[PDB]
Design a protein around this ligand. Structure first.
Ligand SMILES: Nc1nc2c(ncn2[C@@H]2O[C@H](COP(=O)(O)OP(=O)(O)O)[C@@H](O)[C@H]2O)c(=O)[nH]1
Ligand SMILES: [Cl-]
Ligand SMILES: [Mn+2]
Ligand SMILES: [Mn+2]
Ligand SMILES: [Mn+2]
Length: 553
RNA sequence: CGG
């Protein structure tokens, strides 16, 4: 049947100038040495990505799918969802969102300038009046930082971003935002990934794991997922949306956005030229996360049925997936996964790496992270979330005239606070830089999965207690996997090894303590791992007085 | 570019 794309031969052009690094990285050249390995994907590599994702799809459904789709619609039907006022939608546009072709940008939209509010009204009326004319879209390459891996080809080609003009995005939100906040949770319940913090993700997986008489786990990820999404898949997304109780005006807008935007359309590069046509998901539209998550859930739950996965518990995180099931013995389990992959491939969701059965929770990696284990202050086992730090370390080293890495550092410190690599390496480097800049008591802003919240470095110990618990300051005896991986990653980026970080950290601690106040609370809590005479830490009054539920839900 |  359908091709994912077709191209004119016009280049994918850059959204402005694309920054290369500088000869000195003053913030990060005491963190690591191999700055040559850190790189940023650019539009120069866009064509190679385009070759890798242009292919022919041949979806083939079956009773298992149909049965699942059916159940998902009955679940959707228990949702009622309102329209958003043009104004409400305007004010959810982010502060630096790409400006519109019709001579205004995000400032005008969020302030509700009349010029802007006007253009958008007319755009909405055209949605309601015309359910057919394709809507044009811009195509850009994403700028994104990685460490080179010669094992996996050297340098990654940039992924493709495909979005309509600002005005349409606002209309998108009007028609569909309230649904994005309610549907995924409603059809998937506890399987919905983006509702849990790290400690909750870990708790869920453990409960899941212990509930089985004899558990088996595996993860799945679809190769180039957005290009594998079919016109049919997209129309089937519409019907899932339509199964909620909605005002009539939503339905028309939703339906019109589907046929004119979501199922496909022409693509223009930044220079204005016609670039290609698209019959797959455009990553850049409002329905991207919801769509991926839901369409992934359907296919996956079908494939579980297709393959005989017994008593599955799922966690869906976009196109990443984990399933914890009752094992049928390794002979059968291996067969069943081949079947799963076979079904998923029939549903047009082929794998990147073939999945594999596992019987130890530390060896399953999904949503870029994994559960590991260490000992707590009282000798008991303590389970927590962590990840390969390679890419975090690389991003910690991205400095340009326009961009600072301190934000990245913070993001990781908060998300992965219990990790040996955050405690020994990142926390040590973070606090050291800020002390010396004399900017310890100055807010930064941290963004995990969507929005951006302001944080004061001196509040980390409270925020970490609230979010990860007080054991997060006291854990020891990390696992072989986790020790091996951290050492290896530090070697690979030319950063000092752990024993050096022990030295630097003692020194940082002392400085923090000598400044007294909150700084010294940072010193005692965050760096107690670093001294022989470990102190007695106690819950922090500050912590109880805190609401963080907006951060990961 | 979107949650
Ligand atoms: N809008 C948007 N969507 C993204 C981005 N990164 C990933 N996604 C979506 O999530 C899908 C799966 O992500 P991933 O497994 O990391 O990459 P892929 O499967 O190789 O495309 C993508 O195909 C996109 O639709 C991004 O930066 N912006
Ligand atoms: Cl303990
Ligand atoms: Mn994928
Ligand atoms: Mn319709
Ligand atoms: Mn993925």
């Amino acid at each position: 049947s359908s091709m994912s794309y077709s191209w004119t031969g016009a280049l994918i052009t850059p959204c402005g100038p694309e920054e290369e690094k500088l000869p000195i990285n003053p913030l990060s050249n005491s963190l690591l040495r191999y700055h040559n390995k850190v790189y940023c994907t650019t539009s120069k590599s866009a064509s190679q990505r385009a070759k890798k994702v242009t292919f022919d799809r041949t979806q083939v459904l079956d009773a298992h799918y149909d049965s699942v789709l059916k159940d998902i619609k009955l679940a959707a039907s228990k949702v009622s969802a309102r329209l958003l006022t043009l104004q409400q939608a305007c004010q959810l546009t982010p502060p630096h969102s790409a400006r519109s072709k019709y001579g205004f940008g995000a400032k005008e939209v969020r302030s509700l300038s009349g010029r802007a509010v006007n253009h958008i009204k007319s755009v909405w009326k055209d949605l309601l009046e015309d359910p057919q004319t394709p809507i044009p879209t811009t195509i850009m390459a994403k700028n994104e930082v990685f460490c080179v891996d010669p094992a996996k080809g050297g340098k990654k080609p940039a992924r493709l971003i495909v979005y309509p003009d600002l005005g349409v995005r606002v209309c998108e939100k009007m028609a569909l935002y309230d649904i994005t906040q309610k549907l995924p949770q409603a059809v998937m319940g506890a399987s919905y990934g983006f509702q849990y913090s790290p400690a909750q993700r870990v708790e869920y997986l453990l409960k899941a794991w212990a509930e089985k008489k004899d558990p088996m786990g595996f993860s799945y990820d679809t190769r180039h997922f957005d290009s594998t999404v079919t016109e049919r898949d997209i129309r089937t997304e519409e019907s899932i949306y339509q199964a909620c109780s909605l005002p009539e005006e939503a339905r028309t807008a939703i339906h019109s956005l589907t046929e004119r935007l979501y199922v496909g359309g022409p693509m223009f590069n930044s220079k204005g030229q016609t670039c290609g046509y698209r019959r797959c998901r455009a990553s850049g539209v409002l329905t991207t996360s919801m769509g991926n998550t839901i369409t992934c859930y359907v296919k996956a739950l079908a494939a579980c049925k297709a393959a005989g996965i017994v008593a599955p518990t799922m966690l869906v995180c976009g196109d990443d997936l984990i399933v914890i099931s009752e094992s049928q013995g390794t002979e059968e389990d291996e067969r069943n996964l081949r079947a799963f992959t076979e079904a998923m491939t029939r549903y047009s969701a082929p794998p990147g790496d073939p999945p594999r059965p596992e019987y130890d929770l530390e060896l399953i990696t999904s949503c870029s992270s994994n559960v590991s284990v260490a000992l707590g202050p009282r000798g008991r086992r303590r389970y927590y979330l962590t990840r390969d730090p390679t890419t975090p370390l690389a991003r910690a080293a991205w400095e340009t005239v326009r961009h600072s890495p301190i934000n990245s550092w913070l993001g990781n410190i908060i998300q992965y606070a219990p990790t040996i690599w955050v405690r020994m390496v990142l926390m040590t480097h973070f606090f050291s830089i800020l002390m010396v800049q004399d900017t310890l008591d100055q807010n930064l802003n941290f963004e995990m999965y969507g929005s951006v919240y302001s944080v004061n470095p001196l509040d980390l110990p409270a925020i970490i207690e609230r979010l990860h618990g007080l054991d997060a300051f006291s854990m020891h005896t990390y696992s072989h996997h986790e020790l091996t991986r951290v050492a290896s990653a530090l070697r690979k980026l030319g950063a000092p090894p752990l024993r050096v970080w022990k030295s630097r950290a003692r020194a940082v601690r002392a400085s923090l303590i000598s400044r007294g106040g909150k700084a010294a609370v940072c010193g005692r809590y965050l760096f107690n791992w670093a001294v022989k005479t470990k102190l007695k830490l106690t819950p922090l009054p500050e912590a109880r007085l805190l609401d963080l539920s907006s951060w990961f839900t």
